[PDB]
Amino acid sequence: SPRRTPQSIPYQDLPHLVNADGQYLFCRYWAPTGTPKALIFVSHGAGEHSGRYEELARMLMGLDLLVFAHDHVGHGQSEGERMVVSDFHVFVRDVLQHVDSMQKDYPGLPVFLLGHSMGGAIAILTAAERPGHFAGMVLISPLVLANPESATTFKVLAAKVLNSVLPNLSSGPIDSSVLSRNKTEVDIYNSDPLICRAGLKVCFGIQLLNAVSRVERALPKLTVPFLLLQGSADRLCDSKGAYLLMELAKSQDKTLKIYEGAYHVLHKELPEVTNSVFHEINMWVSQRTA
Ligand SMILES: O=C(c1ccc2nc(-c3cccnc3)oc2c1)N1CCN(c2nc3ccccc3c(=O)[nH]2)CC1
């Protein structure tokens, strides 16, 4: 009997990739009609999935880039216990596998990364693992420093799991209403059956603590060009992390745009913010693929 997604769809009916642990990852592709100018991988964040990026991917494909993505392990239509990961580097390893596979099918093309929130930390660590190989990185509120209160409060819960055997202990779920001012986008996110609504298991949040620690160590070695978009009112990825990334990365091509008053999910924010986000990513990628 065929391997099926967590939603019961046979993987034989869907674009897919099997990772190093034998787990099926659901894949998405948006390819132009002409010859692509570059490849770009879209890295989604915790609890969500690659389908959230449909509009942004179609914009990028309109610039004649070949856009590709997968649902990370434990997310969306990929396999794995929901919101569990043996080690955060699994996400990075799996991105590199997909990138490597695509560079075979479309050799000679520059490859970019785009990531949001946890997906932005994945993008950072992916670039850091292959210095000099990626053409650029677009970061939308990447997880660099967590909100100090959410980091401390959770690090307490972590000390419990780290010292005892408590496999089901979890934090409370994050309130999606504090992550975008656009109420319609909040309602859409809360209506998507592929989104994981439960609170973070402490074991997973420990891996997000690991992500931040590894990002910190990676910064003074990071050289990839990047565009960094950050809201000033981000309740999840503290804006101080965006400033620290601008200060500590060694990249010769780094740009920060701050959206004053905007919340965490900038590509799902008020229309004036989201329209600007799309425009600025368009300009940045266009200038680096011309
Ligand atoms: O990746 C994360 C994310 C999640 C939970 C985390 N907990 C920590 C954490 C904990 C302790 C210590 N250090 C870090 O880091 C996190 C990162 N994301 C991206 C996808 N998200 C999203 N939210 C929306 C809300 C409204 C409307 C649209 C959307 C939308 O499209 N996506 C939610 C946030």
Author numbering: 6 to 295
Provide excerpts from the study.
We applied this processing cascade to monoacylglycerol lipase (MAGL), a serine hydrolase that is crucial for the metabolism of neuroprotective endocannabinoid 2-arachidonoylglycerol (2-AG). MAGL represents a target for the development of selective inhibitors aimed at treating central nervous system (CNS) disorders associated with neuroinflammation. For MAGL, an intracellular target, the cellular permeability of inhibitors is a crucial factor for successful drug development.
To confirm and study their binding modes, the co-crystal structures of four inhibitors (17, 23, 27, and 29) with human MAGL were determined. Compared to the human IC50 value of the starting point, hit compound 17 (IC50 = 445 nM), all newly synthesized compounds exhibited enhanced potency. Compared to the binding mode observed for compound 17, the benzoxazole motif on the left side of the molecules is inverted in the new compounds. This flip is likely driven by additional hydrophobic interactions formed by the new substituents in this region of the MAGL binding site. The interactions on the right-hand side of the ligands, including key hydrogen bonds to Met123, Ala51, Arg57, two crystal water molecules, and π-stacking with Tyr194, remain conserved compared to the original hit structure 17. Additionally, an overlay of the three inhibitors (23, 27, and 29) with the hit structure 17 is depicted.
